[PDB]
Design a protein around this ligand. Structure first.
Ligand code: NA
Lengths: 97, 96
């Protein structure tokens, strides 16, 4: 099954991590990115980005701090379901020929 | 849920005007299938919008029994996520 791959940082500063990853073209409608300080100090944060993105800047971080980052591909599927049928027999007017 | 109360409202020598009931907005459309009863493998299929409660079957043979089936059709939307990809990264600078 499809999934994001190759999660790296392309840039780091004292308060940011610029993420980069790969994914099959149009496999995903969006990405869910979850991040939190690794020791679990501070809030777990959830963000969404468009499915065409392959990079994202995590900003407003604390210096010298380890973060656990998770990325999920998100996909929508549309299908049609069918009820059980209702059936009846009817006869047209007139004389059979 | 499913359509209920399939009847004809009108019959002529060449037509059957179908009528049925369904809960408001239960279905996005209806599938109607019909064929001469004493016949196999000549079925006719069509769809109508989910707001409709009648449909005219025309160009039929006189004095002939027809089997008619109606299905309620609903559009299902699914939202799913892949397996996560996870990594740990350290920001720049000195921890405080
Ligand atoms: Na779901």
């Amino acid at each position: 099954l499809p999934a994001p791959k190759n999660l790296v940082v392309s840039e780091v500063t004292e308060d940011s991590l610029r993420l980069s990853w790969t994914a099959p073209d149009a496999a995903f409608d969006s990405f869910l990115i979850q991040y939190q300080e690794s020791e679990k100090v501070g809030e777990a944060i959830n963000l969404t980005v468009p499915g065409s993105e392959r990079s994202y800047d995590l900003t407003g971080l604390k210096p010298g701090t380890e973060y656990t980052v998770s990325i999920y591909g998100v996909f929508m599927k549309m299908s049609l379901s069918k009820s059980n049928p209702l059936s009846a027999e009817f006869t047209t007017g007139g004389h059979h020929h």
